[PDB]
Design a protein around this ligand. Structure first.
Ligand SMILES: [Ca+2]
Ligand SMILES: [Ca+2]
Length: 247
């Protein structure tokens, strides 16, 4: 509650459609155009690995083999209820690609590791956009919600199927328009909605998965990461927009 004050008039203008229940969290957000500052950094966010930010997007992991990249908020958020809207592209030659992209709310920053570019044994929630079918069950690309409390090693080989709280099968690769994921944590419920990028309409969201009465840490960083394997897609994020929800 209470409108954001630590912002310039150009940035106010820049984020106009976002400011105009829902309170825009400027300090936990990024977008183009001019996504990046004259010194190459994304204001309020740190990047690591192979991630390279530019004016229009952050290429988290480019289409080389065995790449890892991530981007994380510099500080933790402390929101009872929240909603992130993440806009991205996963592009590659051919109908099959690897490995995928992850959106995180975790207690620490997962700068580097083996889990879509970020740290294993995390404390909080990952939403995994897993493009490659490691278990051969012919059910990728898939979106899987994986909670963790610092104890679990992510089961890469089964596509996290044995550890997933919820999941849906959606092809988010090679789409005419950017793909969008909206992730909502509200009154103990985690919801994933996907805009699959067939349409110019940015609000054409379809239900994907839900976890009722989920627990997550009271404070955490938001993050996004990706990785490639033998096959390699470009994984690009165009914007990450955070909102704090009340009542
Ligand atoms: Ca996989
Ligand atoms: Ca699979």
């Amino acid at each position: 509650h209470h409108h954001h004050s630590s912002g310039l008039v150009p940035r106010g203008s820049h984020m106009a459609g976002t400011q105009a229940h829902r309170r825009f969290e400027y300090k936990y957000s990024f977008k183009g155009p001019h996504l990046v500052q004259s010194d190459g950094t994304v204001p309020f966010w740190a990047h690591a690995g192979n991630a390279i930010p530019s004016a229009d997007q952050i290429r988290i992991a480019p289409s080389l083999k065995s790449q890892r990249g991530s981007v994380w908020t510099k500080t933790k958020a402390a929101f009872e209820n929240w909603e992130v809207e993440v806009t991205f592209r996963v592009t590659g030659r051919g109908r099959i690609g690897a490995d995928g992209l992850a959106i995180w709310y975790t207690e620490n920053q997962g700068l580097d590791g083996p889990v879509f570019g970020s740290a294993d044994m995390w404390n909080g929630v990952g939403i995994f956009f897993d493009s490659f079918d490691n278990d051969g069950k012919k059910n990728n690309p898939a979106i899987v919600v994986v909670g963790n409390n610092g104890q679990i090693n992510y089961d890469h080989q089964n596509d996290g199927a044995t550890q997933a709280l919820a999941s849906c099968q959606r092809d988010f690769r090679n789409k005419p328009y950017p793909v969008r994921a909206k992730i909502t944590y509200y009154q103990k419920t985690l919801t994933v909605m996907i805009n699959n990028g067939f349409t110019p309409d940015k609000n054409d969201y379809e239900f994907c998965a839900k976890v009722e009465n989920m627990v997550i840490p009271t404070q955490g960083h938001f993050g996004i990461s990706a990785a490639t394997g033998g096959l390699a897609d470009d994984h690009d994020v165009l914007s990450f927009l955070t909102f704090q929800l009340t009542e």
